């Protein structure tokens, strides 16, 4: 029945790292291009439109099996069926795509770093850092840099031979975690949570918050900042400034009363706002203008 | 009449994440009478190799895989099928990527280092799905356009015969950060310092001109200008007096109002609108100014 004999070079990978080995299966395919056989692969029957080609988008790295059967109608009316069991491997990319405004590490938090060596298993690799610690966590690494304003050099080595081979020297910048901005967490007329600029806000909506909260604008950077202490500035009949201290990240009873008896259009300020990041460093963050409405 | 066999013929048995595994599944009619001969790169494969040809990767470059498969065509005539493929050896590398740090900023040039160590820059050609990704010397420049959406950088090597996907990188497009306001002043020695609030001298307020805005970042070497601001003063009757400014400089109204303020008296800088290389105008925080 065959009308087409073809030689094929089927490699494991078309790109190999120096020192690894190129492996290719060389096979003959004697087929009948007239036929359209039923291909059941990985619990699915291929649609005739696929023309025998099975495709799967490579997602997470690992060992993926290709298992099923092929069946076609023989010339005699006897179905001819053949089972198969093959496999493919998904790897990490062998191209580094690094935005330079992103090569940074933050002191005080876990910095997940993906150290990927193609052609070598995750165990054969060893990675070290010159600033802080670089430990393993599952399929990832964790950098905890200690010296802010200095460089962090990640040194990756694989060995896989007689002499220990250097794979990559990566220089990264060490920064303190950013300073947060203060805000007042409030629920709108619908009930949805919004974060005050300041500018203008209702007193019913002010007292609902119960204090000052501190966080970053982003989303860069998913970090917790707590308000240590803050002050509220008020104004008497003599035009003098009255700075009232707060009970931590919550309004004091002296302040709470002042806000109630204040009145619409009247302005108050939140000054000397000290916030604390995971690194434990207390930091002076900016002020907010609060207008009653 | 000899045996029929199922065959899974992939493009590659190893696929990098982001690429797609492609395999042709066929019924092949194998002759069990005689074993064929596989001659590849000047060597005849021994039956023990089971069709597997292996070569140790040495110096980086383009290596060809060439040869033929010979067999008896049942008609006293030997049949030959030639094959010609190739592999690439690369300088041994490792990718060190901090996973949290995946942001591109809209409104500026985002230098991206796309490194495929073994190959040369001509060989590599990267594309982006959000904005533009152009070449600049030994680097690439992403200019993302849609804030809050994803930016997927696709790096390819193309070449003969098949087009190989090198990397698919997921990035987040975010707006440039907002700067913080400051008043630039020279101390008693002449050294420049930046006041962000708290207490400050009278003559030292008068110099410099008005308010300045900046972000402190040595990677994002961007600059912002103060568009407009207000100074909110307080009289003897406890009333708020909001005086507008002449751009990034104090107005003659504000200047004289600061002059008649006694020691300890408080005034504010709110609102404060600043724009960057974006170039987007943005409401930045306020400053409490106390006279010394
Ligand atoms: Zn290998
Ligand atoms: Zn296996
Ligand atoms: Zn039959
Ligand atoms: Zn913003």
Numbering used by the authors:
A (entry chain B): 224 to 516
B (entry chain A): 225 to 516
What wording appears in the published article?
PorL and PorM (GldL and GldM) are IM proteins that interact via their trans-membrane segments. Here, we present the atomic structures of the periplasmic domains of both PorM and GldM, that exhibit 22% amino-acid identity, and provide information regarding the contribution of each domain for interaction with PorK and PorN.
Full-length PorMp resisted all attempted crystallization assays. Domains D2 and D3 could be traced fairly easily, but domain D4 was only partially constructed due to poor electron density map. The D4 domain was easily traced in the electron density map because it was stabilized by nb130 binding, and it was introduced into the PorMp224 structure, generating a complete model. The resulting PorMp224 structure exhibits three domains that resemble GldMp domains D2–D4. The most striking difference observed between GldMp and PorMp is their overall topology, which results from the PorMp kink between D2 and D3.
